[PDB]
Structures are given as C-alpha cells and as structure tokens.
Design a protein around this ligand. Structure first.
Ligand SMILES: [Cl-]
Ligand SMILES: [Cl-]
Ligand SMILES: [Cl-]
Ligand SMILES: [Cl-]
Ligand code: NA
Ligand code: NA
Lengths: 505, 508, 505, 508
C-alpha cells in the first residue's frame, strides 16, 4: 500500500519548501522533499535572494533603524485590512525564522540596501531586506551540482559558471546543506506530486511519480505544498484571466505548471487571486521568451502610438501593472524601449538573462536606425509621435524634471543611476534603438487560500486537516502589491516555517 | 601622412597592454590603445586573473612567508639559465608594478591560495599569486559594457551576467578605469594594427584599420605590441609545428591571429618558441570547440588503447604536454575521461565554459552506459583493457596509492578535491553507474612563442640588436618561461611586468 | 644647521597625526612623524576606535538613513553657533577623509551601532559611527610590535595579547601600514618635540630630542602638532582649573604632558577650553589610577551622604560632568557605586582595564558586606540614608520608572542592558558591594585655537604661518559637549587631513 | 547518607568535562558538574581552542580535502599499533561529537589553518583542526563571568579584557551555555572531589568538599573524571619522573594537582605515561613561572655550552622533548634564546602571557649587551662558542640553508614567519645590536599520563578489567598519543571524544 512513510512531506524545493523542510527536520520530524525536476530550487534559485524578513537579528547587526512595528505599518498602509492577520503573522514571525536558520552553521544572511517599492509610512528608502552570503560551491560538496543554475546559464544549456554561488544559488545551496545536515531529511529529484491521498477527510499522504513508477508516500503530520504557482501553465492562466504569458514567465521552463494548486482544488481547497502575478517588464528574446528587466537607468518607453505612458523607473511590478492597465488589444504589450548609443548599443537596464545586442538585432527583437523616422518605420510606430515624444523627453532631461510621469522623484528611481536629474538622460546620439518589452513575471501569486499557519482552507473557511501551502502555491497576502524586495521569498519562508511548526504541535 | 599622434601607441588591450598604457599615461605620456574587436580584454578578460607577481606589498599584507629571492630560486630551478636576465627582471620588477598599480584608486589586489605547479626549491605549496578584487560594474560607469564577458557568456551570445565583475573582468575593468583616470589616454575598439611604419630604421608609428578607413598613427616614443599570440591562426600554427588547434584554443574566436607577431617579423624581428603554447586539456564541445578542464577531482583518463598514461591531476600545461608526448597518430588526442555517476552525471572537474552533460550526451561528445563493456563499445575502446584499467585504478583508490602514475602525491593534486574521500582525496573509485566517457582534446590558453625581446621589452633582430621604437609583451613575445608553466598567473604576470618595463624604457 | 628636512613634520602618532601624515605622504609630500614614547598611537591606541565621521561611503554600505545635513543639524542643536564654521568643516569633510583612507589597501571601516549621546534633532538612536576592521598582526609585519598595546596589557607590564588587533590597535596598525606604504614617510619613536623654530614670523621647523642628541628638523610646508592634550600634566591642569587628575586620566602615563600646546603658546598661539576634558567615571584602582567605566547596566551611585544624585546610565562625559557639578566638597569625588551579587560579585558595567574584584576587595577600593548597614559602616556612608536610597531605587525598579533622575528613558540607557525597565534592576541579592568612583578622563580637550584648516591662531585671530594643530593639542569644536561616540578621533582625523591639504596648496 | 543524587557526575569543567556533561544532559540524564576553583574551564579556557576532530561536517563546510581515513593513516604512521583501538575510536567518533555539539544553538566551529606537527603520510600541511567561533559575552548572560580568563589577564589579577570571548574562553562559554540550556544540568564551582565511593566493587558516587562541608553525591549511571592531570603537583611529578616543573606549567596555578588520578588509583585504577607531558618551551618569568613560547620566527637557541642543539622552529612538544633529551643536569634546562634588536627588543616568537621586555631585563630573566662577548659573560655562556655559533647561523641565514639542524624545511617552520625575509623566511641573521639572551625552560600545557582507559573512557585495572561506574578523559587519563603531539588540538580533541563516549556508555 504505502511505499514509504515520513512525518512531513514537502512538495517543491524553493526557498519556502526548504525552509519548511528544515524547520521540521531540525526538530526531529522525518522529512521527505520532492522536487519535480532534476534540480533543486526552482525560481528561488534564479532569484537575487533578497528576503523581506524585517526586524530580525540580521538588521540589528547592521544597526538599521527599523522594527517589526515600522514594517507592520508599511504593509498596513499599502495593503489595508485585507489579510491583516496574515500580515501580522508575516512580520511577527520573521525574527524567529531568521534565528532558527542562522543557528545552522550553513546559513548566514546580511542586510543589503535596496529600497522598498512604495512611498508610504514605514517605507525604508534604503530597504530592510537581507540576503544569504556568497557560498563557495566546494563548501557544500555534492549538493552544489544539484542546485539549479542562474538564468544566464540555465537557458543556454549550461551548468554553474566559475564564481561563487550567489543570490538564489547561495540561498538554495545553503538551505539544502542545512536540510541535509539534520540527518532527518530525504531530498529527492525527479519526483512529481500527482495527487493527494485523503482518509476520513484528512490529507494523509500523496501519490507521486518517479522512475516511471507511481508511489504512495504517507505523511503522518502533514503535507506542505510549496511547489510554485501556475506561471508555466498557459491553460490555467488563460482560464484565470492572468495577464502575461507562460512563454514570458521567468520561472524555469516547464517546472511550475500549477500541479499543487490543482491537487489542492481536487480535495476541496479554495483559491484566490489567480489572475495576479509578480509582474515585471521583460525584454523579448529571439526565441519568444523574455528577460527580467530591472534597474532601468536611461531610455524611455512608448506604447504602439509612439507615446510615453508610464514612469519607466517604476519598480518592476508597478511597471508591469501599468503596461497591463494601458494595454488595449496589444497597444502596450509589446511596448518599445527607445534608447541611443550612449552605452555602445547596450540597453540601459539590467536584463536577466543578458542576451547580446547583436543577437537581438539579428532576430529583430531589437531594431536600430540612424534616425527616429526610420526607427519608427521599422517598428510600426508613428514617426511624428515618436520624434515628438523624444524631443519632449529630452527637454525634460534638460530641465531635470519629468512633469508628465514624474520619473526621477523617488529613491527607487535614483538607486540605479550613477545632468540635473540622474534618472533623465537625453536620447540623442545615434544610432537609435527600439527593444520590444513584454509583460513578464517572476511567478504568479494566486492560489490556495491559507490561514496564518499555512493550512489550506475550503470555501467556507474550514481547514483541510493535514494540508498546507506556502509560496506561490498559496494566494499571497500581498494581493495586488509587491511591497519591496524579497516579499515573494519572505512570505514563502515564513509560512513554510509556520506550517512546519503547526505540524509539530 | 599622419592621422593622429601620441607618445606611446599600444596595440591590444589585455592585462599587459593596459598595464603598459597605464604606466605611460600616468607619468604624462599621451597614449593610444588600439583593440581589434569591439571589446577590451582579450583572453585576459576570460582569465581567472591570478597573477604571478611575487614578493610585493600585496603578499606582505597577507603575511605570506616568501620573497623575491625565493621566487627567483624557483624559476631558476625550473628554467635553468636560459633567459636568466629576463627571469631576474621579472621577479625584481614585480613589486614596483604592483605598487604603481595599487596607487590608483581603481586598482587593488589580494593574495589567493593556488599552488605553484612544480616540485622544486622555491615552490609555494599554497601559492604566491594575487588577484584583483571583485568590482561592482557601477563603479566604472560606461567602461563595464566595453569589457569582454566571461567564456560562459561570450560563446553563447551573451553579455555580462548579473553579479560583480570578477577574475579577468575585474582585472580589465579596473585597468581600463585606471587608464581612463589619467586623462592622458585614448581607448579605441575596432581598431586593427595592419603594419608598422619605419623611418630611418626606427619604428615611428603604425598603420591601422578602423571604420573601413586606414589610418596612420604616429608614436613619438614607441609602439608596444601586446596583441596576443598566434593561437587563432591555423596556418601560422601549422607552419610553426604548434600542437593543438585554433578552434580548440580558449582565446576569443578570431581575435588573436598573430597580427603583431607578423608585423614584427616584417620589420626584422626575430622569433622563438613558436611551437609552444600554454597548454591545457579541453573538454570537446558539440560545435568542435573546447572547454578548459581544470581542477580535476575524480575519474581517470585513457588513451585509445583503454589504458591510463598520465597523472590526471597534473597541472593543465603538464597534462597537455603529456597528451602531446603520448600521441601517436591520434592515440592520445582525443583521450577519454572515464567517470561514474557520483556527481549525478557531472564530470569531476571544472570546465570553462560549463556545458551541461545533456548537451554533450545529445551531441555524442560524451557517451554513457550502464556497464564498462558497453561504454567501451560506444567509444571504440577495448572492453577488456578498459575494465581492467578501471579495476586497477579502483584498487589504487582503495589503498590510497597510485603506484603507476603517482596521482595524489602533490599539493596541486590535493588542492581541488572534496572532503570525505578515501585514504587519498585524489583517488576515488569509479563504480556507481551509469558510467561516462568524455572526449578530451589538446586545448590552449594562448600560444607563448613570438618576437624575441630583451629585459625592457624591446624587439630584437636575429643578431640581438634592438629595433628602435618597437616593444612586445604578453603572448606577442616569446615567453621567458620556455616549455614551462611555473605557477598560476605567469602568463599575465610576465605580460604585465614587461609591458611596464617597455613603457618605462619609452619614458627615459 | 638643519639635521634633516621634510615637507610636512608631524608631531605625535595618534589617529589624527597619522591621518595627517598619510594625507601628506600619499600626495607626494615627504613626511616625518615624531612619537615621544617607544610606541605609536597614544590614547588613540587605547581607544575603541569608534569614529564620528557621518554621511560617508561607509554608512551608505550599511544602508543607514542619515546624511551630512542630519549630522549638521545635530551638532547645531547641541553646540549652538559657537564654532559653527568648524562644525561645518567637520561634517562636510568627513566623506573625503574616509574616501581617501579607504582607498589605501590597509584601511577599511564599517558602521557599528552605538547611540549618539544627547536627545536632539538629528540624533541617531542607533548611531552613525564607524570602526576599523579587526587586523591580523601578521598582516603588517614588524609594525604590529610598534603599536601601543591595549590598557589591559599596557598598565600591567605586558605587550599585545594573542588575538587580532582590534579597536585602537587596529586603527593605529592600519594607519601606520598606510603611512609606510606611501614610501614618502619616516616614522620615528623616542623623538620628542621641544620647541618650534620660527623665521621671519613663520614656523619653519622644530627642535627635537632623540638619542640624547638635539636635532633641528626643517619643515618646508608646515608642522602639524597632534600630540595630545595636557591630561598628564598636573601643573597645567591645576593652572587651567581642569577637574580630575593626571593619575586618573586614561592617557598613557606620562605621554601627554601638553608639550605641543606649550610650544604653540611660546610662538604666539592662543588657547581655549583648557578647563575642559573628555570626562568619564573611573573605577578607582589599588594603585591610585582609574579604569574607564562604560556601559553601566545595573547598580546605583551615591554621594558621600548616601544619596543618588545622577542618572547612572548617562553617557560617560555627562556622568563625569554631573560628578563635578555635585562635588562642591569631595562629597561626589569619590562617589560610591552600590551593587549586589547578581553578577557573581562583578561590577555591572564595562571597566577598562578590568581589575578582578578580589584585588579591589583586598586593596579596599571596593568593600563587600552581607547587609547594607554593614556596607555603610565600611564605607562611611550613613546607614539610614543608604538603606533608604536602595529601597527607593528598588521601588522605582518595581514600577519601571525612576521619578528622581529619569534613568531608563533614553536609548543610550537601554543599549547596554539585556522587569518593567531593563535599566532599573533591584539591588537585593547579597553580598552587597561599594566601589569607589573617581573623575577620570579620556584626554583633555582644551588647547590651541585653530581655524577650519587646522591653522594655529593668535589672540587676534590671525594665523601663525606654517603651524597646525589637531586632536587634543587643539581646543575642540565640541566645547562642553561629547556629542556621540568617536567625536575625539573624528575631529582629530578631519582637521589633521585638512591641515595636510592646506600645506599641499 | 547521600546529600544529592544524579545520573551522571562530572568532575572538572574543561572542554572534555563539559562535552561529557552536555552529552549526558542533552539526552535526559540528570548531570552535576563539579569545578574545584571559582571559575569554569581550566587550562581549556587558557587554550587557543584548536580541536583535532578530523573528517567532520565542519571541515566539509570548508571544502577541505581530508577524511577519517587520511587522519587514521596519520595517527597510525606516528603512533604505530600501540593504542590502535583508541586511535580508531578517536577518528571514527569525531564526526558524531561535532554533530551533536553544533546541533546546539550556542555552539559553532570553523576550520582554521594551522599545520599538523610531523612529516608523515596523512599530514595536513595546512591542518585540519577546528575552533569555536568568537562569542559575544552578552549572548550567554551571567555565564561569561564564570569562565576563567585568558592567561594575559588571569596571572595579573585581571578578569576578561574588553573584546569578544575567543579561543578557550569561547569554547568554554559556548559549552557552558549548551550544558545549561538542557535544563538537566547543575554547574557547581568551588566543589572539590576528594574520593570516590564504591559499593560492591562499583563506583556509585563521590565524596566532595564545598562550603567547608563535605558532601556525598550519588551517581546512578557513573562518574566521569575529567579534572586535568598532575601538572600542578610537584610531588606526584617528581615521583613519576615527569620532566619540567609545576611552577613552569601553564595550567592555572593550584588547579590541577592530580586529585582525580589519585582518587582513581585508590579504587584500583591502573596508570600509565605519568612521566609524559604536553611539553613546550617556556620563557622564564620574573616570578619563576613560565610563558608558552610558540610560533618562533627568528633568533636561535643555545645550551649552556653556547651551541645550537635543535631546530628552534620545531613544534613546541618536539622542541621541549629535544631540551629534555639534551639536558644533562641543567645544561639544556635552561636554554638561552639569542636574538638582536630587529624587533626593537621584542623576542621573535609569541609568548603567552606576553610580559614586556623591560620587566624581564629588570628581573634578569633576559640580559642585553652591545656585544656577544659581553652577552656571554652575563649569561655564563662561553664567549668564543657563542660568537662562533652566531656567525655560523648567520652564514646559514645568508645561504638560506641550515645544514646542521635543517630549520626552515617544513611547513610548520614557515607558517609563523613574516614576509620579505631573504632566501629562507625561517632563517634571519642575528646582527643588529644590542643583543639579548632570554632563559627558556621546559614548560607544559598539562601532563598527559594518568588512568588507563578503554575506547569508552572506562577506567581499567592493571589486568585490563573495567571499574564499573568509573570513567576518565582529558589529562586525568593516559593519552592514546603516547610520546607524540600529532597536531594542533589533540589534547582537547581526545578529551572531548572520550568524554562523549563515556557519557554515551553511561546512557546504554
Ligand atoms: Cl524581489
Ligand atoms: Cl594561470
Ligand atoms: Cl567615544
Ligand atoms: Cl594544540
Ligand atoms: Na551563459
Ligand atoms: Na593583561
């Protein structure tokens, strides 16, 4: 009947999942971690591993003037009372999560400056998020080769490049080492959750595919599903009304297809926010995929009418949401980023992965021209509107003020730029370029409804015993907002920890 | 006649070239740097930026027990008296080069452990080489985007990945910022030396292609040619008898085609060591290129007879030279690296660039099999020999001693191995299938033959006389190291010292 | 005539002096540093090496929300307009000093939390001061053995203990290595300034004793005198009306006897603030010296009448100034710190150097008793007043409020303490102890009048050509205030730098 | 009858004792720790807290190429088959001890480079030992003040200096916090074991003095005696034939007077190796005591005949043993360390505690002179021999080779030497006067002879049988290392492994 048995079954291997697994395994509960693909970490591995866990011992070490209450105030100011109990659990539990994790020899974080994303009471203009320290891959042995590589390697048929493991690779490599060190955890790759097993109304285990064979794994205390969102599943996204496209998602291709959300729905779990994502502008690639565009430091962006319609320096989720709001049957998706040869043909932003300009020009995702009139012809933009847009923006750059969209009036805008306003630079030294910008995502954020301890709830608010969800398998407490750097990982980690604690009671 | 004029004309933009440029420009000499391609740095940018500049203030700050004389002793012990004057200039000048460079706010180095490569008096088992600190690209402005990206990006149609600039990218980014900061230097890309201009027997400038137009650039004090070797030029390699192949070279494809060496020969420069390179084993790629294989930590290697013939843990140049020495009509090039599934299908070494196993297996550069007999059939190796080779190696791993090739009896062999191995961290049994065989070819990190030079980088004629106004350093010059790669950073260290000395000579 | 020549002659080898020397030597000026004793560093070597240099790249790395203007506002709020130009130069120049120093491979700093000392607009409750990184003594070669050792070694006939060089020893060891690295500087020990040499009204060099021989050293650009204060000169202190005593000073015994201040007076330099010091409470030692008492976390303090008279948690300079104000009798100098056995007999504060309780008890600097009545008899304190004082304090601890002196109503009070108020802890588990507390100092702060570039001024405000002063050789811009951690070193370093820059013009 | 009762009674509070206590208390056994003095930690607190626990998770996290088997090979190569079972238990159990301890939130270690002490198969030239992380005293509350301070404070009437707790202070502070955190342990100071209580041939408890009153404490599972060696007991040392002197021992004055070893003998425990110690050269102090001399980086050493007789750069135990071997009725004890004014009068080594040169000169433990002839007169050395010895050594320094004692031919010798020496960083000419001679005596870091034990720490009788209920570890026990100090951290590492194993045995 049962192929194996454990106390805590964890589905997925991102930051949340591994934090849940660690929490369970470190207090003596036998734990099995199931990863679908041949690598641990998912999108978490791709990430910069900024983590929004405020008011902890990490920020105390840095002498940061902030607190749990200040962070609570910020969330409340942005999110309102919707999900206030989960907002409270999120900020209140951050210190304990960080304390537990840093008690492991394989884990250490530090504060790294990066501004919160909205002007509101409680905002930190320099940020409050933390990051794992760089990791020498030699220091975790055979685990390094099981961590998913960064986007710049993973989508070009490559494994890790020669430096240290940084960002998400450090996060996942350190979490894995921690989980392994407990001696209470079994880490499996190529093991796919297919359905949950329910007895007398309680989730008691799961059915799983690996090795072509199907298995049944018993979970005495519970199942934590932290297996990502629906971002890779075009059908679910289209049914939910999610903007963007699977092909533009920055999740690992084919990994996060909503399997855990579906398995949860099948046993009665309610869902929410399925039309929402962690949005970002994406630089369209030759193969139809996208690259995360972050840290804009020049150029401007136009809709298909050749006009500016947003502050290009906006945090990525707000940028993406403005694309979607402006879009009318494709007038803003794609949009076009217009820039000159100031950076030798390079686009003035950080693009992940970072495809050379020559490949884009060869494929036609970018076009270049000696004049704006010619650029307009090649892109389908109106020449007069485009010329007029650029002249107006260049006047704004001269004055150092953008009266139309107020670019360069916020610490986030200034943060990425080294004239009168560092964020406003004239577009004037040809050749000129236009890059297609699409509506990408860093995962979706809709999913199973959960309570403050990660328990999956039915439509009436009752808890499905034995079943927990966190990360993008769960509907985010953040609703339509991306409050600052590290919220996706921070929420994932806090609720995975709380789920494991609940299972331990 | 002249399109522009400067005091010091530098051809190339690797570590050496930029160090020469900095040295000239920082003491007031107007300098022009010509880079052939659209990015600065060449192979130097690809490098790990380990630099063998011993006995300097950098190693003092690490409390390293070493000195100029200890380093001199090591070179002498390996190289003998051949080029002893240039050996002396190399070690004696290192401290002044480092001191000059670290004076610049854009440049700082630190010691990083990595062992010297030969057992000899003066060897540092932990190393003595230094590296530039990681560099936030934001700290050098628009120069970051002009630095050539790492191999793992540059050969897949990509620009820099998101972290800091490290290794060669930090080296070149910092050097460029230093050169720019002088206010005496002009840095040019897509500018190609075609020939040297000689008046009354003196090199007085150069002819250069850029923008489809040809230019003539006057050099009042001299021309420093640090434009790399012949690695990318199959013809020059074949004429010279150089082993390996241009496509297997780890230099940037098409950059280093021996142009400066040819230009030097054309004005009377003598050459030497043209059959020599900085060799390394390369993991054959699906497209016929190679990947630098360094830091071997498992597996074994066989020739086409299914037998071991070298210590697989040898420093890369010695490994390469052993392939070439063993090779008889292709019996050792390619060789086959045999490994098991201990690392989940990964090859137990550092491969640059790091192509995923699945691509290799799809292309057939690697083959996998559940047994050795089958692995032998898929590679052409004799099954009995292969099986026997692996059993014997596995016995050696059990005992912790390799009596046949003495692998794991040297700090270099140990340095790259992970913990919790056996008796000998370099000897790990090949026993948990599936088993794999990867083709290994004779790659290079540049060639090291070229124009004959003196202690101040001046290009010499066959009779030993100096061609006035003409200097060479880096792989445009014949290396003082001859047939030896003494330790980490010798190619960059020699390039940097002699570029500095050339610029100092021009300043007299 | 002249024994040697240099561009810049620096007298002293504390943080200021070496920073001045570095600034000169790093831009090509030949520099000679003269240290009186056989070790470099003076009191600076003894220090914790907290440095109040606000709004620099160091605090930017830590994401600290502060700025030059915020720091300027704080000084102005405390100090008023007296010395406003020098207040401006101090805060405005801090970034450049830090930038120059961190450009040297031997120097790096980091922010370390430690609150500013007064409630006022611009205060950083977590601080804004910075510290040199720990230094492995092996990394600076033979220089390590030329750095003065910490107080816990230096006053017991010892050289450096085995760990890294930290605090002032790291500051001085890194500054020395930086100065040496320039190849433009000569570092001399056992070389004592005796008088300045003036030609045509310009200071052109100095007369110096070393090796029993007197020398004359020519200074082409100038002489920087950063040779400490008058703290070790009982006569100068008495003449000036400086409270405390030379033996109680935490300066190195006999080093800082006001030599440079006298030499300056002798060529026409005006002086100011000579009755002022950087004050601190000191734990009286068996040999009549003192130990810096900092980070009070328990106990209470009484005058000779057995009554509390100050907030015992005050920053040290305010504590010291309150002792002096209350002491119109020897009634407050000594005072008595009353504590119980909560810390096993240890005094609840940090004492530098840290003499064992058993030595104090043996010498009678401390007394112990099973009751307060007996403690009073052994100390001379009135028993009833003492008992009553402790009971009242204990009631305050119970309520969590000290109505009499408002202890525990400030971030500085809280910072050092791990009931209702962490700073108020009942004194109730015997045996009970009384330790004598005297009015110590961390150097005096009166001296030669100087301008924004460190030039020594005459009584009419005119500058004595060729002559500069900084650190405690100079009258501090801070007047009667110690604004926060690192002001003594920060002012010393900024004005030494500015002096060297002025000499370079 | 019984004053109190516990499952496991631990005598002593050094690293071993507290590790035993933790092991017992963390798995639910009630534990009482008895410390004789008013501070916890003993010599362990004084130590650098290097710990030789190879092949554990700690060295894995540093990527160190080493293993259990490599370590086993090293011990076997030095020690031979004598105590091979205990050698095996030591290396095999290290990982589990580390794992258990690092599971506690108060404990974390890291690898720190420091070479193993002998040239032999399995030596790590960089070392394999680990150290506790620096500890903020605020993180363990009232326990910090109960930890014995470092030597540089403890022997001058001082408590902890102002930095973090490091070395032994960190080790003991973290262990204490871990023990306390179990909620199963009672930590007592000023509680002195006087004798063991035996019923029907089983040790069932102990008699203990504290508060002037005598107590009887029942131990249901057993008594672990980890109360140090005989180092502080001149009578026991003289009876055993131990070289050195109590007054020169680096143990805390009066703490380790062999009380547990005597108590064990009294109930039938056999003893071994009582004439052995963990030896070191000691710089003789004004008060007749000594200071650990480690990390020699200059000077030379002579016997009373003014001649060199050993490699001065030898690891401390080998240095000490060479003094003892050469000594003939005081010809080598004291020896004289001869040095010049290169370091301003400082002795070229690390001395713990670090008494200023002026105090030595004032007391006459050191003498200074402008010439070697005079230095000789003041020390009782022959002038000609001394002069000749120094001239010969200076020639060796010039050549960079010491043909007589081969100093500077080993990674340990090099490890402590600053840069920019000459040919050999360990050999520096003695030539810039004044010249100094410092008296060097035969100090110790504890003795290593004591009660015979098995792989689980059980005290054995002369016939090899185990005394039920009785365990010993650390220097209360005879060391498995015999006459050898294999590398850094062996005294603490053995103490900790056998204390853990004893507690595990008691838990069965
Ligand atoms: Cl983020
Ligand atoms: Cl190299
Ligand atoms: Cl301060
Ligand atoms: Cl040791
Ligand atoms: Na790539
Ligand atoms: Na001391």
């Amino acid at each position: 009947d049962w192929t194996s048995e454990c106390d805590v079954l964890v589905v997925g291997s991102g930051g949340g999942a591994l934090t849940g697994a660690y929490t369970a395994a470190a207090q003596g509960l036998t734990t099995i971690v199931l990863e679908k693909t041949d690598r641990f970490g998912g999108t978490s591995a791709y990430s910069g591993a900024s983590i929004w866990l405020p008011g902890t011992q990490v920020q105390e070490r840095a002498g940061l003037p902030d607190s749990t209450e200040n962070a609570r105030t910020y969330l409340r100011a942005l999110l309102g009372d919707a999900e206030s109990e989960r907002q409270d659990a999120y900020v209140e539990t951050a210190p304990a999560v960080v304390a537990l994790l840093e008690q492991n020899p394989n884990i250490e974080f530090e504060f790294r400056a990066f501004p919160d994303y909205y002007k509101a009471e409680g905002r930190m203009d320099t940020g409050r998020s933390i990051n794992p320290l760089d990791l020498d891959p030699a220091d975790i042995g055979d685990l390094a080769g099981k961590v998913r590589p960064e986007l710049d390697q993973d989508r070009t048929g490559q494994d890790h490049a020669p430096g240290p493991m940084i960002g998400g690779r450090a996060l996942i490599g350190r979490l894995l080492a921690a989980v392994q060190s407990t001696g209470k955890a079994e880490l499996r790759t190529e093991s796919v959750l297919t359905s949950l097993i329910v007895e007398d109304g309680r989730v008691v285990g799961a059915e799983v595919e690996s090795g072509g064979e199907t298995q049944r794994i018993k979970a005495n205390r519970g199942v934590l599903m932290a297996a990502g969102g629906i971002e890779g599943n075009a059908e679910m996204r289209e049914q939910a009304g999610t903007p963007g496209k699977a092909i533009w998602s920055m999740g690992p291709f084919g990994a996060n297809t909503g399997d855990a959300i579906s398995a949860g729905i099948a046993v009665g779990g309610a869902t929410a926010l399925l039309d929402q994502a962690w949005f970002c502008p994406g630089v369209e690639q030759p193969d139809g995929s996208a690259a995360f565009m972050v840290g804009v430091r020049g150029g401007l962006v136009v809709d298909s009418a050749g006009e500016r319609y947003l502050n290009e320096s906006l945090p990525y989720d707000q940028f993406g949401r403005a694309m979607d709001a402006h879009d009318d049957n494709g007038s803003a998706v794609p949009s076009f980023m217009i820039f000159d040869s100031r950076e030798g043909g390079g686009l003035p932003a950080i693009c992940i992965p970072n495809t050379a300009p020559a490949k884009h020009l060869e494929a036609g995702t970018w076009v270049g021209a000696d004049t704006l009139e010619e650029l307009a012809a090649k892109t389908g933009l109106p020449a007069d509107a485009l010329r007029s847009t650029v002249e107006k923006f260049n006047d704004a750059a001269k004055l150092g003020v953008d009266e139309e969209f107020h670019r360069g009036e916020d610490p986030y805008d200034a943060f990425f730029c080294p004239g009168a306003n560092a964020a406003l630079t004239a577009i004037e030294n040809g050749p000129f370029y236009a890059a297609r910008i699409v509506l990408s995502d860093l995962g979706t954020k809709g999913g199973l409804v959960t309570d403050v301890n990660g328990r999956v709830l039915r439509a009436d608010g009752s808890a499905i015993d034995g079943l927990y969800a966190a990360g993008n398998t769960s509907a985010s407490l953040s609703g339509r907002f991306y409050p600052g750097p590290g919220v996706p990982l921070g929420t994932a980690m806090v609720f995975s920890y709380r789920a494991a604690q609940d299972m331990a009671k």
